[PDB]
Amino acid sequence: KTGLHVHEKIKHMVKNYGTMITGIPAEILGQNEAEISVGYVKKMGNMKENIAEVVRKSEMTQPTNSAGKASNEVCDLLLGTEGASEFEKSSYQVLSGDGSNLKGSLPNKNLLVRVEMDRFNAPQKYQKIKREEFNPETAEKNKIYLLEDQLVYLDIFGKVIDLGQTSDTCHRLFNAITTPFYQNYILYDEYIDPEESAEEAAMFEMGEIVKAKMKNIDCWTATHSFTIFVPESDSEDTRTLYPYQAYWTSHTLQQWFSGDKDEKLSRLGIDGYIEKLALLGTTTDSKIRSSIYGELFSPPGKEHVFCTGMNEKFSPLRVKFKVTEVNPEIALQNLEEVQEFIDTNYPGENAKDQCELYKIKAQEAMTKQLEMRL
Amino acid sequence: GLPRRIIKETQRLLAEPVPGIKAEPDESNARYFHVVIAGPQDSPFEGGTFKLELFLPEEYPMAAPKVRFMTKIYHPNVDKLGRICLDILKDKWSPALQIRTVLLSIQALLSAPNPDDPLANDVAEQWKTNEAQAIETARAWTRLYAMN
Amino acid sequence: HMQIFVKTLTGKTITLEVEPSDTIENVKAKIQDKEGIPPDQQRLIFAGKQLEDGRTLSDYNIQKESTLHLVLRL
């Protein structure tokens, strides 16, 4: 019931204060937003009344919708800067097929899980090229390159990675592809038939060569980040978890807590959540992946359109987790320090007027900076 | 020099077009689809028919297809030019997506606007502000530019 | 080779070591290593213009002691 007080406390504070739980003075936000947003001011005319509109347009006091920043703020509040920094040093563990290692990493103590989810950023394009033509720095990145004597992959960093093909195979595939359009095309075209022509057989064979070689090339890049608070419970059949998350260009942690999606996903139960999380990484069906992604990571209400049509999850996903312990008194003390900071520097009879006063202070600092500079 | 993907996409789209979406190519440039989307039911755009152009780049399907609303429409996601602000067309385009998915997303966005992280100007601020008269000004735009 | 700085609205300044050859996605991976933020969410602004994922640092005329801005909203 004390870890439950921790959860209730952080939920209430995020819901009522948005970005103010970061403990950062409004003046700093205003000044740095003025420093980044001076090029957007109209350079002519009465610009004081013209910087008024750029200050009004600003959303500097709105909480971040970067999921990584939200996870960082949650870790800060729950572990202090020190325990957060030490949690940073821990290594992620890839989730198992059944998610059993995660549930085995959840003893009946106040726990914090941090999850990083990766896309498989495999190359989707190929191009014939001659070794004289090839310059890795300027060439297109994350792209397969077919040469007369070599088949390489130019990765996301610009490192040429050989695909273990002989000059005979490469010469055959290079000369078999004659059509001028297929000189710079895609790797896995559904409408290509290998038995129709020799060129399309070449393209299919190259596609499968790359598809097999990528199976052991680290194409994983991070696409999502969230946290999970699992408090201690009286039993084991009443214990529950609460996922905390923002989503890039979708919603803030504030909006997540407002729609109570933490409680909705807590109703799934520990095993109920972990099973879906593991299936997300193990499945091959694109729409099963899409529906689980939308159930778990969408803002409340948009579960059924989050990953449909164009946002369909076609890339294989992988879930990684790290777990540490939460001392409820440290978390409550951090939250109390944030609350006293807010009440002392931004007074008011309710959190809402305090948020507005914070916004006004930020806007005034931004105005003073933009004025003293122009 | 049209890839068989383009012509077989066209053949499967004529063999199966979207209800309410009529896409058929013209001959001076076969990469051009005179697409027409009528306003879905229960929408402020219902009863109107919005003509759009869909241009396949030569880099299709590596590059996303250009789609532009010819008709003017009051919506918090298309601008004055009619450039639809699906994030498909600039970044998050992949060859797994096709013309039919682009048209599907355009129709769905017509049935469900998004004015909170949008591209439109006073349209978007007035949509998040006052949904009622925003919907109704969209209704009037429909009755003016989309009925004939 | 080269030191660059990345500042954010929160006031935090982080220091990366890169080369002009380094792709933007490599800088995003370094920011991930130092701050745990997924690259798919980082916006990098130099001289008021987004840095695009296919390009490199030398494409944006980014040289030594330069300062970039990590935008984490939309």
Residue numbers in the entry:
A (entry chain A): 8 to 381
B (entry chain B): 3 to 150
C (entry chain D): 0 to 73
What does the paper say about this structure?
Recently, two L. pneumophila effectors MavC and MvcA, were identified as structural homologs of cycle inhibiting factor (Cif) effectors. Non-canonical ubiquitination of UBE2N by MavC abolishes its activity in the formation of K63-type polyubiquitin chains, which dampens NF-κB signaling in the initial phase of L. pneumophila infection. Here, we report the structures of the MavC/UBE2N/Ub ternary complex, MavC/UBE2N–Ub (product) binary complex, and MavC/Lpg2149 binary complex, which provide important insights into the mechanism and inhibition of this transglutaminase-induced ubiquitination by MavC.
The insertion domain of MavC contributes to interaction with UBE2N, which also interacts with the head region of the main domain of MavC simultaneously. The MavC–Ub binding buries 2580.7 Å2 surface area, including four contacting regions. The deamidation site Q40 is also contained in this contact region, which may play an essential role in the presentation of Q40 to the catalytic center of MavC. The sidechain of Q40 also forms hydrogen bonds with the amide nitrogen atom of C74 (A74 here in the structure) and the sidechain hydroxyl of MavCS73. Interestingly, in structure of the ternary complex, no marked conformational change was observed for the K92-containing loop region of UBE2N.
